[PDB]
Ligand binder design. Structure first.
Ligand SMILES: *[C@@H]1O[C@H](CO)[C@@H](O[C@@H]2O[C@H](CO)[C@@H](O[C@@H]3O[C@H](CO[C@H]4O[C@H](CO)[C@@H](O)[C@H](O)[C@@H]4O)[C@@H](O)[C@H](O[C@H]4O[C@H](CO)[C@@H](O)[C@H](O)[C@@H]4O)[C@@H]3O)[C@H](O)[C@H]2NC(C)=O)[C@H](O)[C@H]1NC(C)=O
Ligand SMILES: CN1Cc2cc(C(=O)N3CCC(C4CCNCC4)CC3)ccc2N[C@@H](CC(=O)O)C1=O
Ligand SMILES: *[C@@H]1O[C@H](CO)[C@@H](O[C@@H]2O[C@H](CO)[C@@H](O)[C@H](O)[C@H]2NC(C)=O)[C@H](O)[C@H]1NC(C)=O
Ligand SMILES: *[C@@H]1O[C@H](CO)[C@@H](O)[C@H](O)[C@H]1NC(C)=O
Ligand SMILES: [Ca+2]
Ligand SMILES: [Ca+2]
Ligand SMILES: [Ca+2]
Ligand SMILES: [Ca+2]
Ligand SMILES: [Ca+2]
Ligand SMILES: [Mg+2]
Lengths: 214, 454, 466, 216
């Protein structure tokens, strides 16, 4: 099958910029390539077919180019609606194969996260479970690494993370990490910590608490 | 009656190009009338016959015409694990041409096509193709509705049903006043014959070069049949449009099938959904009844009338002997919802092998008396067999049985003078409609100008 | 008493004869003033007219060539007589009519040419195997009817050009049956195989080496082949004095004139021979199929009798074509041509079952009328054709020629010939409108108004210029 | 206009079969090819197969031979995709596609049919208040919605009152059951000065629990 290497995976840009997505194939496809758009949480819309031709209804700021095995999609003067996912698909051979995808994200000034740690509630402890929650809200860029520590030692089993799309108001990202243990194991230890590693500080942002103590 | 047979205009093309096989008048966006001429054997880039189209400006002196340029390179597209191929060698570009608005439609009935998928193939077959040009803007587009990608084995399994591989789309052509192109494809459906219709505007908006196989959603093809009466009938050898059901919002199609029902020949009047309204049957087998069809109101009652040419009709003569001369049939449309009856008038040729009725051109009202008139071709008629075009004038009861004017060929023997005709357009702007006559055998076109009546 | 000859009051001997075929003219000098010179021949002798001066031509008809009808057409050196008499002299005065006879015989043991023209498209794969002994089998049955038989063979498929021809892949051109599990011959329009010959075993052996090709559309190019087999006299080998049978076998519809436009071929068929040394039709891909009217001209021109030996699925078709080409016979062929032998014999019997007279070069002023005597001495008025005949039967016709007035040319000639026959009756007409006494006229006679007139046949005539 | 309207989301068990639909709107389904494309967050987009509804002929990626079955009924102008012996890996969004002009392209897309394979039964969520520990100018509360099935759930604060300054995170699958969390930030003078409640509704099991956040 034909491998479609689409690059880059994502890019942080601003309105009115002129940007270009590329797509590389394992072999020649002689302009038999299409380009697709998927606005967040919605379906797909066709942009380009046969390498360069605009699908009816697509604005002229879009444009496809390339030949042989290297093609490009270009957006001149980005619009607020153009921040979405973009994919390349080759139909030179069956089976049709798709590229990895490219997400356009709003660019802004960096911002450190606001960390908050939450011990297990009382309702959860009386049933036989124990979940520590660690919120990391409103930050930029998206790249972030959470690390859970029990009595100072790292813990990697039973962690459950969740991220949000780029916020509509301030264009920041947020993350929810949830460490889940049993009630019997939550009380073997005392100190619970979640470290946050962001490009806004060489020192990890640490928030923690101690069981029983408050 | 009042065509000028003294001072003609001669346009001419390359030797052996069959310049004049097909012609039509072309008005640009400003209304200036030119002549579009197809030369189906014009040489291409590889010095091989591919056909060609010329756009002749109106000059009383005539002469040479500039080409209307089209792409003549064979195309290849490797898509969908398949290989699509067009072959334009000996395609016959210009074997039919027709104008509508400022758009020219020139067709290559014998353009070939094939599809390769590993070791299998669709078969190299003449699907035909039509090229569309807007001369003032330089816009181009193609339309080839019979191209397919089904492999040969499949057709065999399904007993060759819906086999559009040998259509020869563009063999005949016409365009409705609304702008819907209609192509006759006598080879469609394993030589039963089909029609293809699609709005010109959508052909342009849906075409991109190099795609070779694309969809035109607004198109509409006629239907295959299992009735042997239609087999090898070449339904779509000739085509024309008119008003025949009393509904002015609907446009009706007239189709020639000159080998229908074991070479009896037939002509059918359909609606735009290819539903049959009337059927005219040939009078004599192999007469090729349906070779040409013409639609015009000749008796001045507002209802279009039908003319059908049977250029090989053999007339009965003394001592039980026959004589191929050709015959033309006039059918007058009756008032209101009723069937077209027996022919109102039979016109029969005189010169043996003259092929009277090979072409039939509405002239409009030539002598300006309120009744439209026609011209009939006998491309090997006249006492010399060089060719003759005969004018018949309309009257309250149909047409006159005897001609008003006879045009003798000004070309040498073998010119096929009259094989193509076209009238009802005023080219010098003198208030009288004129006639252009093709003689592909001589690679020339003759323009006759109508003058005030003497 | 007076009659139309006198009461018309004629001026000369010429005008006298023009009144009625019964009138006569007296050129004698000693004739009373009141007695007329233009009366019945009996009245003139009654009025002491010198017999030598009487101008009274009688319409007659005498034979010049009256060869006897041949009992046998076998042998000889084309000295067979089929029509008697072969030449007569005819003399007619104005508005008169004379009658004569003619005999026609369908002679026994007359030589025969049979050219087998065979469809060899893929649909005929099975027929080839059933006629591999046809040459000997046919010689055995025809030996009962003729001692001079010659047979030949040609084959056709269709025009070797797209779309009739498969043109992909390259392999398909050499072998059209490639996409199946067999081989067949490359497509070919028409090929002559065997010139007409009396060595019948050459037919069998050339047949055994034949094989079929394959094309796309069911209708085939047989009419192209009928044309060439007709107009290529020398190559096919039709003999002058022989019945010409062209046996056309097919299992499908046929292409007709103007079909060729689907192959881009528009040039009309020219009716000329185009089969060269290679024995193939070289204009197949460049010249349209022939028209029925053109085929009729060439078949009639070369005295060819066409035989549509077709299968029942298309007999109604070819029976209808047969009606548009007079002289053509149809027989029903089995799906493998297993009955083609009897079909040919019954066609030869049906072909020689009719005698139909034809007239050539008849002047405008002459009209003819015919009385036929077919069967056993049964007269049939107003008929010039017999039917239901057998080999060796003889018919006769009575003919009356009625001339209108007098024509300018006094000696013409026309021909009576049965359709297909070699021999013929030539009629040399002479229009005796003038008098012998006109050759001895006296121009500027001093008997006629002091040299103002001419004296001919005993009367004065106003000379030239008056 | 051209629109592809697919079937509603499907919620099935492993080993069973399901038949998605793709109904044509504004055109004849018989006109073009009809493709089926599978989408997942990690693996991305994958082409399943195609069908020419005029004749019923189909093509498939060798990866789906056995599970995917594409059919078409020109009568109801609808194309179908049948999946068999379903698996957790068959949980994905499925789109039907057709080209605009180019016979081979992928231009018009349906909305997509959501498929979820799971043996889980209809389980109600467990709502847990999340109060901070025993200081600044900005305070942050939370609400944990754990162990429910199937999706989705609607979470608000003070019954839609407190809307701004809120982050409700996407649900995550935790051992065949879903877990969701939500945070909210206000000023220190607002809490515990003003009662803040977490309203959680799970229409599947028909439960609307509400937990008031209480400090420690
Ligand atoms: C070869 O040539 C023959 C000779 O023409 C053709 O046979 C004729 O075919 C036509 C069409 O099928 C026939 O026309 C029809 O006649 C019917 C009545 O005919 C009567 O008289 C004949 C004379 O023998 C009788 O045999 C017969 O039993 C009848 O009693 C009408 O019913 C038909 O009209 C109806 O259908 C037509 C369309 O076909 C409509 O237009 C009409 O409105 C109406 O609904 C029609 O008129 C003709 O009778 C046939 N003649 C004979 C002698 O059979 C062959 O078809 C032809 N074959 C080939 C292969 O070319
Ligand atoms: C065996 N054979 C006979 C033969 C038969 C037919 C035929 O009758 N049909 C039935 C009608 C079918 C369409 C009708 C309209 N709808 C679509 C299907 C097509 C096939 C066509 C071609 C043909 N070609 C010859 C060539 C040769 O003689 O070499 C041959 O090989
Ligand atoms: C053909 O036969 C007709 C009779 O059917 C002949 O007609 C008669 O001919 C005789 C000749 O003596 C006349 O006396 C009769 O008056 C004719 N009867 C008619 C014309 O009704 C006719 O002469 C014959 N002609 C030929 C050329 O044989
Ligand atoms: C001419 O006709 C008459 C009567 O019709 C007949 O008796 C006579 O024999 C005929 N003459 C010849 C030479 O046949
Ligand atoms: Ca209408
Ligand atoms: Ca009218
Ligand atoms: Ca007029
Ligand atoms: Ca004019
Ligand atoms: Ca054929
Ligand atoms: Mg055949």
């Amino acid at each position: 099958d034909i491998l479609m290497t689409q690059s880059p995976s994502s890019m942080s840009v601003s309105l009115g910029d002129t940007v270009s997505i590329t797509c590389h194939a394992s072999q020649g496809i002689s302009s038999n390539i299409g380009w697709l758009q998927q606005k967040p949480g919605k379906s797909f819309m066709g942009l380009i077919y046969y390498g360069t031709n605009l699908v009816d209804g697509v604005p002229s700021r879009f444009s496809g180019s390339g030949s042989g095995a290297d093609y490009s999609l270009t957006i001149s003067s980005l619009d607020s609606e153009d921040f979405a996912d973009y994919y390349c698909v080759q139909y030179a051979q069956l089976p049709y194969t798709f590229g990895g995808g490219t997400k356009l994200e709003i660019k802004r000034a960096d911002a450190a996260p606001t960390v908050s740690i939450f011990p297990p509630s009382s309702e959860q402890l009386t049933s036989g479970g124990a979940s520590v929650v660690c919120f990391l809200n409103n930050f930029y860029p998206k790249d972030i690494n959470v690390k859970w520590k029990i009595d100072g030692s790292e813990r990697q089993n039973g962690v459950l993370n969740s991220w949000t799309d780029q916020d509509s108001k301030d264009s920041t990202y947020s993350m929810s990490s949830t460490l889940t243990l049993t009630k019997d194991e939550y009380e073997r230890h005392n100190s619970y910590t979640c470290e946050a590693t962001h490009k806004t500080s060489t020192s990890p942002i640490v928030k923690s608490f101690n069981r029983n103590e408050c | 009656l009042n065509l000028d047979p003294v001072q003609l205009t001669f346009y001419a093309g390359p030797n052996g190009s069959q310049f004049g096989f097909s012609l039509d008048f072309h008005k640009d966006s400003h209304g200036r009338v030119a002549i579009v001429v197809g030369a189906p054997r014009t040489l291409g880039p590889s010095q091989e016959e591919t056909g060609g189209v010329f756009l002749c400006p109106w000059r009383a002196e005539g002469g040479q015409c500039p080409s209307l340029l089209f792409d003549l390179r064979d195309e290849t597209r490797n898509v969908g694990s398949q290989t699509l191929q067009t072959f334009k060698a000996r395609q016959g570009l210009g074997a039919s041409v027709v104008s509508w608005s400022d758009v020219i439609v020139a067709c290559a009935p014998w353009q070939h096509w094939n599809v390769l998928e590993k070791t299998e193939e669709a078969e190299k077959t003449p699907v035909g193709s039509c090229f569309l040009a807007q001369p003032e803007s330089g816009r181009r587009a193609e339309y080839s509705p019979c191209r397919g990608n089904t492999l040969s084995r499949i057709y065999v399994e399904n007993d060759f049903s819906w086999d559009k591989r040998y259509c020869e789309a563009g063999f005949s052509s016409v365009v409705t006043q609304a702008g819907e192109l209609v192509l006759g494809a006598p080879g469609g459906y394993y030589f039963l014959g089909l029609l293809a219709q699609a709005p010109v505007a959508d052909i342009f908006s849906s075409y991109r070069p190099g795609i070779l196989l694309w969809h035109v959603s607004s198109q509409s093809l006629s239907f295959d049949s299992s009735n042997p009466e239609y087999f090898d009938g070449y339904w779509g050898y000739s085509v024309a449009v008119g008003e025949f059901d009393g509904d002015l919002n609907t446009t009706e199609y007239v189709v020639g099938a000159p080998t229908w029902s074991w070479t009896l020949g037939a002509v059918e009047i359909l609606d735009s959904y290819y539903q049959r309204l009337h059927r005219l049957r040939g009078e004599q087998m192999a007469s090729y009844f349906g070779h040409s069809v013409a639609v015009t109101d000749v008796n001045g009652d507002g209802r279009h009338d039908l003319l059908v040419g049977a250029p090989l009709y053999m007339e009965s003569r003394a001592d039980r002997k026959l004589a191929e001369v050709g015959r033309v049939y006039l059918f007058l449309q009756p008032r209101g919802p009723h069937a077209l009856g027996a022919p109102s008038l039979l016109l029969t040729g005189t010169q043996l092998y003259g092929r009277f009725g090979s072409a039939i051109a509405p002239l409009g009202d030539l002598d300006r008396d309120g009744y439209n008139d026609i011209a009939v071709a006998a491309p090997y008629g006249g006492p010399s067999g060089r060719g003759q075009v005969l004018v018949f004038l309309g009257q309250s009861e149909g047409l006159r049985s005897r001609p008003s004017q006879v045009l003798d060929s000004p070309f040498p023997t073998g010119s096929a003078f009259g094989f193509s005709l076209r009238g009802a357009v005023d080219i010098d702007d003198n208030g009288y409609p004129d006639l252009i006559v093709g003689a592909y055998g001589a690679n020339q076109v003759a323009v006759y100008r109508a003058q005030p009546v003497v | 008493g007076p009659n139309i000859c006198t009461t018309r009051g004629v001026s000369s001997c010429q005008q006298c004869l023009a009144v009625s075929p019964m009138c006569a003219w007296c050129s004698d000098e000693a004739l009373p003033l009141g007695s007329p010179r233009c009366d019945l021949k009996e009245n003139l002798l009654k009025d002491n007219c010198a017999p030598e001066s009487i101008e009274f031509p009688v319409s007659e008809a005498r034979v010049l060539e009256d060869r006897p009808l041949s009992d046998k057409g076998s042998g000889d050196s084309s000295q067979v007589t089929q029509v008697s008499p072969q030449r007569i002299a005819l003399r007619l005065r104005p508005d008169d009519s004379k009658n004569f006879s003619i005999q026609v015989r369908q002679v026994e043991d007359y030589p025969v040419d049979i050219y087998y023209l065979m469809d060899l498209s893929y649909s005929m794969k099975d027929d080839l195997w059933s006629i591999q002994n046809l040459g000997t089998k046919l010689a055995t049955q025809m030996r009962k009817l003729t001692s001079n038989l010659r047979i030949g063979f040609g084959a056709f498929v269709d025009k070797p050009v797209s779309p009739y021809m498969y043109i992909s892949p390259p392999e398909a051109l050499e072998n059209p049956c490639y996409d199946m599990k067999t081989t067949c011959l490359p497509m070919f329009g028409y090929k002559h195989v065997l010139t007409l010959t009396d060595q019948v075993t050459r037919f069998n052996e050339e047949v055994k080496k034949q094989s079929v090709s394959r094309n796309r559309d069911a209708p085939e190019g047989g009419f192209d082949a009928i044309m060439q087999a007709t107009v290529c006299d020398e190559k096919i080998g039709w003999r002058n004095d022989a019945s010409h049978l062209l046996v056309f076998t097919t299992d499908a519809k046929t292409h007709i004139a103007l079909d060729g436009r689907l192959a881009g071929i528009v040039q009309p068929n020219d009716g000329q021979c185009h089969v060269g040394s290679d024995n193939h039709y070289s204009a197949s891909t460049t010249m349209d199929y022939p028209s029925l009217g053109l085929m009729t001209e060439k078949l009639s021109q070369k005295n060819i009798n066409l035989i549509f030996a077709v299968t029942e699925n298309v007999v109604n078709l070819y029976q209808n074509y047969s009606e548009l080409i007079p002289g053509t016979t149809v027989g029903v062929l089995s799906m493998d041509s297993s009955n083609v032998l009897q079909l040919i014999v019954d066609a030869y019997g049906k072909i020689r079952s009719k005698v139909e007279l034809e007239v050539r070069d008849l002047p405008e002023e002459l009209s003819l009328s015919f009385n036929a005597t077919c069967l056993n001495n049964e007269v049939i008025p107003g008929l010039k054709s017999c039917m239901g005949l057998k080999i060796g039967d003889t018919v006769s016709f009575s003919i009356e020629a009625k001339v209108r007035g007098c024509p300018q040319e006094k000696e013409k000639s026309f021909t009576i010939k049965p359709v297909g026959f070699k021999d013929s009756l030539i009629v040399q007409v002479t229009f005796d409108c003038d008098c012998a006494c006109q050759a001895q006229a006296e121009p500027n006679s001093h008997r006629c108004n002091n040299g103002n007139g001419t004296f001919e046949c005993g009367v004065c005539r106003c000379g030239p210029g008056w | 206009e051209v629109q592809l309207q697919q079937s509603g989301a499907e919620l099935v068990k492993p080993g069973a079969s399901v038949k998605l639909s793709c109904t044509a709107s504004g055109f004849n389904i018989k006109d073009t090819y009809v493709h089926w494309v599978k989408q997942r967050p990690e693996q991305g987009l994958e082409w399943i197969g195609r069908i020419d509804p005029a004749n019923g002929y189909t093509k498939y990626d060798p990866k789906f031979q056995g599970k995917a079955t594409i059919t078409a009924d020109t009568s109801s102008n609808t194309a179908y995709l049948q999946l068999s012996s379903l698996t957790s890996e068959d949980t994905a969004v499925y789109y039907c596609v057709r080209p605009l002009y180019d016979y081979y392209a992928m231009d018009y897309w349906g909305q997509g049919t959501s498929v979820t394979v799971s043996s889980a039964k209809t389980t109600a969520p467990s709502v847990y208040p999340l109060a901070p520990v025993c200081t600044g100018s900005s305070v942050t509360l939370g609400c944990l919605v754990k162990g429910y099935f199937p999706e989705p759930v609607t979470l608000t604060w003070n019954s839609g009152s407190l809307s701004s300054g809120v982050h409700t995170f996407p649900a995550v699958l935790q051992s065949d059951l879903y877990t969701l969390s939500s945070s909210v930030t206000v000023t220190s003078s607002t809490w515990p000065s003003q009662s803040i409640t977490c309203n959680v509704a799970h229409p599947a099991s028909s439960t609307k629990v509400d937990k008031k956040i209480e400090p420690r």
